[PDB]
Design an enzyme around this catalytic site. Structure first.
Site, mmCIF file in Angstrom:
data_model
loop_
_atom_site.group_PDB
_atom_site.id
_atom_site.type_symbol
_atom_site.label_atom_id
_atom_site.label_comp_id
_atom_site.label_asym_id
_atom_site.label_seq_id
_atom_site.Cartn_x
_atom_site.Cartn_y
_atom_site.Cartn_z
ATOM 1 N N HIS B 365 0.760 -1.241 0.000
ATOM 2 C CA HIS B 365 0.000 0.000 0.000
ATOM 3 C C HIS B 365 0.791 1.292 0.000
ATOM 4 O O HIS B 365 0.220 2.380 0.160
ATOM 5 C CB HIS B 365 -0.945 0.043 1.199
ATOM 6 C CG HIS B 365 -1.927 -1.081 1.247
ATOM 7 N ND1 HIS B 365 -3.206 -0.964 0.748
ATOM 8 C CD2 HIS B 365 -1.826 -2.332 1.746
ATOM 9 C CE1 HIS B 365 -3.859 -2.100 0.952
ATOM 10 N NE2 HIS B 365 -3.044 -2.945 1.555
ATOM 11 N N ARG B 557 -6.333 12.108 5.903
ATOM 12 C CA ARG B 557 -5.361 12.304 6.996
ATOM 13 C C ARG B 557 -4.385 13.396 6.610
ATOM 14 O O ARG B 557 -4.075 13.574 5.419
ATOM 15 C CB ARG B 557 -4.578 11.016 7.282
ATOM 16 C CG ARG B 557 -5.380 9.953 8.008
ATOM 17 C CD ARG B 557 -5.770 10.429 9.386
ATOM 18 N NE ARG B 557 -4.602 10.493 10.230
ATOM 19 C CZ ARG B 557 -4.253 9.541 11.091
ATOM 20 N NH1 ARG B 557 -5.012 8.459 11.223
ATOM 21 N NH2 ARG B 557 -3.147 9.672 11.835
HETATM 22 C C1 LIG Z 1 0.184 2.126 3.949
HETATM 23 C C2 LIG Z 1 -1.230 2.638 3.788
HETATM 24 O O1 LIG Z 1 -2.047 2.577 4.697
HETATM 25 N N1 LIG Z 1 -1.512 3.107 2.577
HETATM 26 C C3 LIG Z 1 -2.678 3.662 1.945
HETATM 27 C C4 LIG Z 1 -3.359 4.740 2.883
HETATM 28 N N2 LIG Z 1 -2.524 5.441 3.669
HETATM 29 O O2 LIG Z 1 -4.579 4.733 3.053
HETATM 30 O O3 LIG Z 1 -3.660 2.585 1.637
HETATM 31 C C5 LIG Z 1 -4.827 2.998 0.878
HETATM 32 C C6 LIG Z 1 -5.614 1.753 0.615
HETATM 33 O O4 LIG Z 1 -4.838 0.910 -0.215
HETATM 34 C C7 LIG Z 1 -4.407 3.721 -0.480
HETATM 35 O O5 LIG Z 1 -5.542 4.170 -1.117
HETATM 36 C C8 LIG Z 1 -3.426 4.942 -0.192
HETATM 37 O O6 LIG Z 1 -2.932 5.579 -1.379
HETATM 38 C C9 LIG Z 1 -2.250 4.348 0.607
HETATM 39 O O7 LIG Z 1 -1.319 5.412 0.756
HETATM 40 C C1 LIG Z 2 -12.034 6.915 2.251
HETATM 41 C C2 LIG Z 2 -11.503 7.464 3.628
HETATM 42 C C3 LIG Z 2 -10.133 7.746 3.818
HETATM 43 C C4 LIG Z 2 -9.074 7.662 2.691
HETATM 44 O O1 LIG Z 2 -8.962 8.869 2.008
HETATM 45 P P1 LIG Z 2 -7.978 9.227 0.888
HETATM 46 O O2 LIG Z 2 -8.507 10.439 0.305
HETATM 47 O O3 LIG Z 2 -7.826 8.113 -0.043
HETATM 48 O O4 LIG Z 2 -6.518 9.561 1.750
HETATM 49 C C5 LIG Z 2 -9.705 8.200 5.015
HETATM 50 N N1 LIG Z 2 -10.569 8.411 6.035
HETATM 51 C C6 LIG Z 2 -11.893 8.175 5.897
HETATM 52 C C7 LIG Z 2 -12.800 8.628 7.065
HETATM 53 C C8 LIG Z 2 -12.392 7.671 4.679
HETATM 54 O O5 LIG Z 2 -13.746 7.393 4.510
#
Ligand SMILES: CC(=O)N[C@]1(C(N)=O)O[C@H](CO)[C@@H](O)[C@H](O)[C@H]1O
Ligand SMILES: *Cc1c(COP(=O)(O)O)cnc(C)c1O
Ligand SMILES: CC(=O)N[C@]1(C(N)=O)O[C@H](CO)[C@@H](O)[C@H](O)[C@H]1O
Ligand SMILES: *Cc1c(COP(=O)(O)O)cnc(C)c1O
Lengths: 830, 830
Positions: B365, B557
């Site tokens: 990831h 985040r």
């Molecule tokens: C290491 C980790 O948690 N990675 C992350 C994220 N932090 O959410 O996983 C999600 C789910 O695959 C991806 O969409 C993001 O680009 C990736 O950076």
């Molecule tokens: C979908 C989701 C994420 C992931 O967001 P990205 O824009 O892909 O960093 C994080 N937090 C919550 C509450 C979500 O629903």
């Protein structure tokens, strides 16, 4: 089947489907993977269903009518299993038995799966439980308030003859009876400091611990009344217990929450012993602080939280509230009531004091010094600053009362002080309770007198009106109907069922004392009970006993004052006499000793090792045969008590005269057909008085003799010198006869017996074995033994907790008991 | 009302009574004292009732048919509320809505009471949750396995513009969805040592922690399939955690149990960052060890625990089992599978290895170095001795494979090693996963390529067959039907309902791109959504916004790579331009930024302070009026996401090209009618490719440009020198324009931006604001804006997790998805 109620057609059908509903929807299981434990829960839930209806209307009722409320504060509530007891008070036993039978299950086998609610050490905790049951049965608006420890009294394990303690995770599988009420969480403060500003003192910069309540229903006997037992659980606030910033670590902060929550983690395993640890004190203020807020809130609503004179006049507080202090453990309720009244409600000291004394009552449970609570001032000083100030102020005014009553009696002054000078200053909690309560009571006639004559003499001379007595009792429901259905049935066959809630009616059994059928029956149930126990023994613990022998049992916490050691001496004596004249006939006996030793009580644990050591020798001597067995009943607890007591022939209540406040085990044996060999101590006096000394095996020193001996000075050597049999035993212990591999193993016991026996075991030896001979004689005459038993059973009525509670109610709380059935449980949804 | 199902006559009546049953019997409350929270629980229980029937048959089904089982191991499962989602998948929404309405309650008001199940940090955790929902919908015999933290992601509080963290006690009031299964508790070992004796190694003298499972049902979409999510909870054994005798204190021993139970106490709040703490590692082995025992037990029964070849032949293990590693967190599953197989089952190494590699698959990831797990050997050495030995042995054989494939390539050898030499030796968990898995996959096309081209190049050259790609997706149910019923309804009005489980069908909406009614409708729901959010804002957080402005939002985040800072620069720029020409017209915008910063991430917390600081200035400048508002969305979480996303006009996905593995938030915005301004990073590439670059706002450096810049060397000063507007902003920050009282407050940000910007924020500034101008232009043309939106929505089908799971299923697990309705829920009781 018995009078466990009716097995109605409609209700058995109804039960079954609900049993199934729960198995499916609640337990989320299917008949093909369900285990006995699952079946036990389905049932529990089904039964619990039946009293929620009543629980809600009872509580709603008290809200409408608004009667005076009784609050029983105790750090202990020794409940035990609650399935059967609930079925009994709800007349559901036969119906459930039938229904489960049709479902192809053995109800008894399922009942054995329920874990004991061991939130108590012994007598003090069990009293509280019997009291609750009695207060519900007598229709009192009473609430049991305590702490919900997640770990109760430790489970005892015997390893190599030694007791091993292990955590009692009674909630591991869940508690179907309790109802978490997170919505009623209250805050409790600790530490901080006191600020004195313009209009009053302020308790400031305190640490907050939250108190989450859990309600458990307490059903009265067949009257549709279901009261509430509210247990508090410590929870950490999510703010400061994280929010007090500036480095430390976020993770660590969350992990440290288990520091405020430790308060309700475990019960202190001490019976009749005081340990001044901070944690304990914290538990004591926790239950007090939370409970009081709950009491005042309820009061603020009453009928004052509508109209009445209009103006929060706490003048009617004592007319609506009554709080009973079970020993000094909840003693802080007094200064805490003052704190709220004076600091928060802003009442003048004198009005506050009047109210407090009028609503508080104290019950004393012991006279031994080591069990008295004397808290070091530096502790109170750090943990509860404002409370200490209040106590000093109470002390100040009290002593002024004394000085005024006894001018010039300077020694009296120091003696009565709530503050004790010396090494470290302490606060005598007992003195506190007496001063801030309108009634103080002993738990047995002799105990009560001793208080007035000794320990609290000065207080008695000051306010004689405060002191009363309230002899302990037990509940006929759990301690007769529940554990001994057989005996209850035959009794009912002759005199009816009304005695279950009116135990005095047992006197009518006197007129059957010569009835041939009855005598046979009484004798029969006891034989059946002994057989069932003898089986249970091989079932769960394994290694045979003889059901034809006399069942000699002593079960209670291990203590030096209980004198299990004196019991030991007799046993060894029997052994030695047999080894002397092998081919001489003697009445066979199975002496069973059981009970738990507090983990830090070295002597008590030494005694357990002695008992097991004696059995190792005795039980494996071929010459003895089946004439004498020594067995140590493991993990003695309520559920175990319900099994042995009904199977007992001889009950051992041999404490040193003047040490056992009352005792309740003794009563349990009397009501279940066992004869008593004991000393004129505690309630034993009232029992023999009730059944007639001819039907009791009394022996040993009376209180006066004990004192005479103390004036003279107790010298054990004298007895060692004049009694060969006694000498022989001591030398057997000293030489390793009972501990081959470790010959000096019992030196501490011998040393203690000879040089520092506070309870003069030797002084009652001679009269004890002599007396034991008399019971063996009588046992040889079945018909007469049974007739004496009928004399005890028929005369135990006075020892029902219903009587005790009725007396507290009238003579202390100012409420009238009532055996009126609450208006059915019937549906209703407003 | 909508297509939330049918509000049948019989079922609404049925619901109501059950709602009442629970209020009475389960909650033990009466309508007169019940609060919204109580009503929420009555409902929850009523709804939960409806899926137990199906839960039981689903599980029973898999037992009978015995298909290949999928095990999804993840330390995170970001579930959120589960009431609504359950009603939706069970077609119960309208019926419940009706029933509660008749009971006089607002269902929506009750849904807001459910606490979020925040057992996740962000994207990685939420993927797991969407995956679960998809696997159930596709009828796979899949189980989600994780840890039941009692404290999830912390609740964020903004105090004085700063983030304050506070414990997330989500279980405080109970979790009606989970089912404790204490009967399936398993033991997990820690520490100890390895004994090598005659026939094998032995893991000895270990500390035991028990693992108690809790099952939560996962219902598929309208197919009667309810899978299981099993979460483990740490419990201390009652023996050794008390029984290891010889002084310490009995009380202390019981209090110390909260040391083994700390393992499942709290989730580590890190997103894309590796912290090598012992506790974390302990959590990682805990979930692995327990889960595996559960997997093998199930396997031992299967149809082998009856007959088959007869001989526990694990040769069929990979044919029956498949475990997916969500990142390297559960990486120890590999060596642990070997341990059991080799040490306990006694299989030869090679056979064990074959089996392991065949059943394990790994999902990567991220590519940022600081998020890579490299555990210090001394840690593994002390905590899991035998596992370390296995890893070294795995490493040994692997490297031998490499040497054989690339003779003489000594540098390659050190580069590929699972063991990293240096300051302290570490174990590269990622290298471990690759070696012991038959498939490795990226989460987006570009990300996957980057892995093969960069980070795992050597591994790719060694075994090209192992590497695949599986572009992330999201569930249409929660992320469309649940959060945006309005949009879902109008879509269904035109093309039906079949698209909910077949999102590709959304393409048919293309033919309405010129439909006057549709355009109006799409535009209408978005207007309604914006109004509802604008209200919620004043309701729960208080201080007005304008619903007519463009809703510019970035929620995820807080990270340096996410570049919230770049967003900040644009905002300030807009402000400055307005302050330059006040009376010039500009499209009004409400830019909303929200997200949580990990507690130890200083920079991220500094950025939050910056955002709030900007709003303090901008929101109180009279000249700006309602043309520009800056708002920081507090406590961004799943439940909050379901509110903002549907109300968003512009979605911000502006990470530095090559840093965001995929992202899923972006997809959520695309499906809910928001246009995207972003960089060619992660899934953004596939989104624009799917909707056509003309309907996307792409800008900035591509991956290649980034690299070109790095060769050259990134110098921010250059951009500072050539762009006045940019210069002006930096000097505003440097001088305290945004922090009057503390003029040097943002020195760290400025310093970082100018000298150590790892993500070259300045390099994309110019193209970003230019591009933002283009979106403002298009917003001025409602009809065209909406038409472009229809182009995105109609083309987002590929981004459904159903597609992703279907691909995992076929290309990795070797199972065939099925949209076959399981044989009704119908009663049944065998
Ligand atoms: C290491 C980790 O948690 N990675 C992350 C994220 N932090 O959410 O996983 C999600 C789910 O695959 C991806 O969409 C993001 O680009 C990736 O950076
Ligand atoms: C979908 C989701 C994420 C992931 O967001 P990205 O824009 O892909 O960093 C994080 N937090 C919550 C509450 C979500 O629903
Ligand atoms: C201090 C204490 O707990 N005391 C005791 C007991 N330890 O059980 O309380 C019970 C209940 O009143 C009495 O029967 C005992 O004689 C008394 O000693
Ligand atoms: C009644 C009871 C006690 C009290 O026994 P005494 O003989 O009065 O010391 C202690 N423990 C249990 C399990 C009891 O039921």
């Amino acid at each position: 089947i018995s009078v466990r109620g009716l097995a109605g057609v409609e209700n058995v059908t109804e039960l079954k489907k609900n049993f199934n509903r729960h198995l499916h929807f609640t337990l989320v299981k299917d008949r093909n993977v369900a285990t006995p434990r699952d079946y036990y829960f389905a049932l529990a839930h089904t039964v619990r269903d039946h009293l929620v209806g009543r629980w809600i209307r009872t509580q709603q009722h008290y809200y409408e009518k608004d009667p005076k409320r009784i609050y029983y504060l105790s750090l202990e509530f020794y409940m035990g299993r609650t399935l059967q007891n609930t079925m009994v008070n709800l007349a559901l036993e036969n119906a459930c038995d039938e229904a489960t039978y049709q479902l192809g299950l053995d109800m008894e086998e399922l009942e054995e799966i329920e874990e004991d609610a061991g939130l108590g050490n012994g007598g003090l905790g069990r009293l509280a439980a019997c009291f609750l049951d009695s207060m519900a049965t007598l229709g009192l608006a009473a609430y049991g308030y305590g702490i919900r420890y997640e770990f109760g009294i430790f489970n005892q394990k015997i390893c190599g003859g030694w007791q091993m303690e292990e955590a009692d995770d009674w909630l591991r599988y869940g508690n179907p009876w309790e109802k978490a009420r997170p919505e009623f969480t209250l805050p409790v403060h600790f530490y901080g400091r006191v600020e004195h500003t313009s209009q009053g003192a302020k308790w400031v910069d305190t640490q907050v611990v939250l108190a989450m309540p859990y309600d458990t229903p307490v059903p009265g006997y067949r009257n549709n009344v279901v009261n509430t037992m509210r247990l508090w659980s410590a929870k950490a606030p999510n703010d400061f217990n994280l929010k007090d910033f500036n480095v430390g670590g976020y993770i660590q902060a969350v992990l440290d929450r288990n520091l405020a929550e430790n308060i309700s983690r475990v019960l202190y395993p001490n019976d009749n012993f005081f340990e001044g640890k901070e944690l304990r004190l914290k538990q004591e203020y926790f239950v007090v602080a939370a409970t009081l807020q709950d009491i005042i809130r309820r009061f603020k609503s009453s009928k004052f939280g509508c109209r009445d004179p209009v103006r929060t006049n706490f003048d009617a507080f004592p007319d609506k509230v009554a709080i009973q202090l079970n020993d000094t453990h909840p003693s802080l309720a007094i200064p805490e009531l003052m704190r709220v009244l004076v600091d928060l409600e802003r009442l003048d000291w004198d009005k506050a004091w009047e109210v407090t004394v009028k609503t508080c009552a104290y019950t004393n449970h012991t006279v031994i010094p080591e069990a008295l609570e004397r808290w070091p001032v530096h502790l109170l000083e750090t943990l509860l600053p404002r409370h200490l100030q209040i106590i000093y102020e109470i002390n100040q005014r009290f002593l002024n009362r004394v000085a005024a009553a006894f001018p010039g009696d300077v020694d009296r002054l120091r003696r009565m002080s709530l503050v004790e000078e010396g090494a470290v200053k302490r606060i005598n909690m007992a003195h506190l309770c007496i001063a801030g309560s309108h009634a103080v009571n002993g738990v047995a006639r002799i105990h009560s007198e001793i208080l007035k004559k000794t320990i609290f003499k000065d207080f008695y001379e000051l306010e004689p009106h405060k002191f009363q007595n309230k002899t302990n009792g037990i509940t006929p429901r759990r301690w007769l109907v529940l554990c001994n259905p057989g005996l209850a049935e035959i009794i009912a066959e002759r005199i009816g069922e009304e005695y279950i809630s009116d135990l005095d009616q047992l006197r009518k059994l006197l007129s059957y004392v010569d009835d041939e059928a009855f005598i046979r029956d009484v004798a029969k149930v006891k034989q059946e009970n002994k057989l069932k126990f003898a089986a249970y023994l091989e079932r769960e613990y394994k290694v045979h006993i003889n059901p034809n022998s006399l069942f000699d049992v002593q079960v209670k916490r291990i203590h030096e004052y209980k004198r299990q050691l004196l019991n030991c001496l007799h046993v060894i004596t029997l052994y030695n006499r047999i080894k002397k004249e092998p081919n001489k006939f003697v009445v066979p006996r199975t002496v069973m000793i059981g009970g738990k030793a507090a983990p830090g009580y070295h002597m008590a644990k030494m005694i357990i090792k002695l008992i097991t050591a004696i059995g190792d020798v005795v039980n494996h001597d071929p010459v003895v045969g089946d004439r004498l067995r020594v067995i140590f009943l493991e993990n003695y607890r309520v559920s175990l008590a319900e099994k042995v007591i009904p199977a007992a022939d001889l009950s051992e209540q041999i404490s040193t005269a003047g040490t056992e406040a009352s005792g309740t085990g003794n009563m349990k044996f009397m009501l279940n057909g066992a004869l008593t060999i004991g000393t004129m101590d505690g309630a034993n006096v009232e029992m023999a008085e009730e059944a007639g000394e001819e039907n009791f095996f009394i022996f040993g020193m009376r209180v006066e003799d004990v004192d005479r001996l103390d004036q003279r000075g107790y010298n054990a050597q004298e007895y060692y010198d004049r009694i060969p049999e006694l000498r022989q035993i001591i030398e057997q212990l000293s030489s390793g006869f009972f501990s081959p591999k470790q010959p000096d193993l019992f030196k501490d016991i011998v040393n203690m017996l000879m040089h520092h026996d506070r309870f003069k075991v030797f002084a009652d030896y001679e009269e004890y074995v002599k007396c034991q001979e008399r019971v063996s004689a009588l046992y040889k005459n079945p018909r007469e033994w049974t007739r004496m038993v009928i004399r005890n059973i028929a005369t135990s009525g006075k020892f029902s907790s219903d009587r005790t509670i009725a007396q507290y109610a009238r003579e202390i709380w100012g409420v009238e008991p009532s055996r009126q059935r609450l208006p059915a449980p019937d549906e209703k949804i407003p």
